[PDB]
Curated annotation (Swiss-Prot):
EC number: 5.2.1.8
Principal cellular location given in the protein's record: endoplasmic reticulum
Compartments reported by the entry: Endoplasmic reticulum lumen
Name of the top EC class for this enzyme: isomerase
Keywords: Calcium, Deafness, Disulfide bond, Ehlers-Danlos syndrome, Endoplasmic reticulum, Glycoprotein, Isomerase, Metal-binding, Repeat, Rotamase, Signal
Name of the protein in question: Peptidyl-prolyl cis-trans isomerase FKBP14
Subunit structure, interactors included: Monomer. Homodimer. Interacts with type III, type IV and type X collagens.
Cystine pairs: 21-79
Keyword Metal-binding on entry: yes
Amino acid sequence: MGALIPEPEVKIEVLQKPFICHRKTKGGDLMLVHYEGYLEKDGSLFHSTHKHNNGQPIWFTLGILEALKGWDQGLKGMCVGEKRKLIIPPALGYGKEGKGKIPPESTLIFNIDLLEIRNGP
């Protein structure tokens, strides 16, 4: 019974949220983020800015399917200084194909810290 199968959806946990919030992310915003990505099955790290990007954060454009679908679903309405944990099912991650350090059908965990927001083009 297909009718009882829900659409894949990210679980969002807010790990840290500052008292201050001047601005929340919206579609087209540039987000400066640190992240750590883990495999849910064993908790092992597969990619992080800290380890795989020489300790440097990266820019991500929200809401244009620039990266994982789960990122677009999980990073809206976020303020600078906020840290979220996303549990991303494979259909919103790397799917049946997987990639590189990610096997097919992997559930993923991302801890993502928002450092800065800028206007997008």
